[PDB]
Write a protein that binds this ligand. Structure first.
Ligand SMILES: *[C@@H]1O[C@H](CO)[C@@H](O[C@@H]2O[C@H](CO)[C@@H](O)[C@H](O)[C@H]2NC(C)=O)[C@H](O)[C@H]1NC(C)=O
Ligand SMILES: *[C@@H]1O[C@H](CO)[C@@H](O[C@@H]2O[C@H](CO)[C@@H](O)[C@H](O)[C@H]2NC(C)=O)[C@H](O)[C@H]1NC(C)=O
Ligand SMILES: CCCCCC/C=C\CCCCCCCC(=O)O
Ligand SMILES: *[C@@H]1O[C@H](CO)[C@@H](O)[C@H](O)[C@H]1NC(C)=O
Lengths: 55, 55
């Protein structure tokens, strides 16, 4: 259960190699948090749902 | 702490500071801004831009 920069949710947070040069956090078209940046070293972390839809 | 990947600092007349595009802190509305800077690793030229809002 994460509270990151005011955005709350449930998910898995992983560290990525990507380098996004702008912004602090990123959201989807539906308003869900997708990634955020550590303000000390600039590393970008991604957030994914814990459970997904299956058939 | 200063992150290693700062590339632009924008200061607004209303006191807002944008670092890499994100507003991280706001002070009181500013009337005057004194600065005195120098650098050697900024390639060949680095710019200071006075800008106004436009659509
Ligand atoms: C953001 O990055 C900084 C810098 O890597 C992280 O601080 C490090 O934390 C580890 C684990 O405690 C220490 O071993 C390092 O010495 C710290 N480095 C510093 C202070 O420069 C920090 O934890 C990261 N933030 C988050 C939320 O993950
Ligand atoms: C800030 O540093 C970056 C590199 O970290 C500079 O961008 C590079 O500029 C050189 C010289 O033209 C190019 O060969 C590289 O390909 C550029 N790197 C890129 C685009 O990732 C940048 O010019 C520096 N900025 C200032 C204002 O000095
Ligand atoms: C006026 C001197 C510089 C201001 C210092 C501000 C202190 C901390 C910086 C916080 C913002 C970090 C943004 C991350 C930038 C990035 O890695 O792309
Ligand atoms: C991401 O970084 C890890 C650790 O260095 C590396 O093992 C992995 O191959 C990298 N992934 C990509 C796509 O570069």
């Amino acid at each position: 259960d994460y509270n990151i920069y005011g955005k709350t949710g449930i998910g898995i947070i992983r560290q990525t190699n990507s380098t996004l040069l702008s912004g602090l956090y990123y959201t989807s078209l539906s308003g869900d948090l997708l990634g955020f940046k550590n303000v000390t070293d600039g590393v970008v972390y991604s957030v994914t749902p814990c459970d997904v839809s299956a058939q | 702490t200063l992150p290693p990947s700062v590339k632009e600092i924008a200061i607004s007349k209303w006191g807002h500071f944008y670092i890499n595009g994100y507003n991280f802190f706001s002070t009181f509305p500013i009337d005057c801004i004194s600065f005195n800077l120098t650098t050697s690793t900024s390639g060949a030229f680095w710019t200071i831009a006075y800008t106004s809002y436009t659509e």
